[PDB]
Amino acid sequence: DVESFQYGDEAGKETIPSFTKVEKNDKGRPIKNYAFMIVKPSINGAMNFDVQ
Amino acid sequence: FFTPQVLALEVDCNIECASLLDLYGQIEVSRSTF
């Protein structure tokens, strides 16, 4: 799976972590920023490695 | 008959030089001949 997202070439390099790996609360909720990356499924699975 | 104790270090002894690639201006680009 994905762990972080890169947004920009040089100045913007905020590797915003994914919701999967992030500092969670005692309940399960995160505490720091994260991103979603909702994806539409396709043939041959590849949940995030497939073509759009 | 005597099996050596395979210890777990791995000497490298290989320097890089210096990435001077954060000073230059970077621009994400697209299909060539911009």
Automatic annotation (TrEMBL), chain A:
The chain holds residues 159 to 210 of 420 of the full protein. It comes from the Viruses. This is Portal protein.
TrEMBL record, chain B:
Signal peptide: none annotated. It comes from the Viruses. This is Major capsid protein. The lineage of its organism: Viruses, Duplodnaviria, Heunggongvirae, Uroviricota, Caudoviricetes. The chain holds residues 174 to 207 of 465 of the full protein.
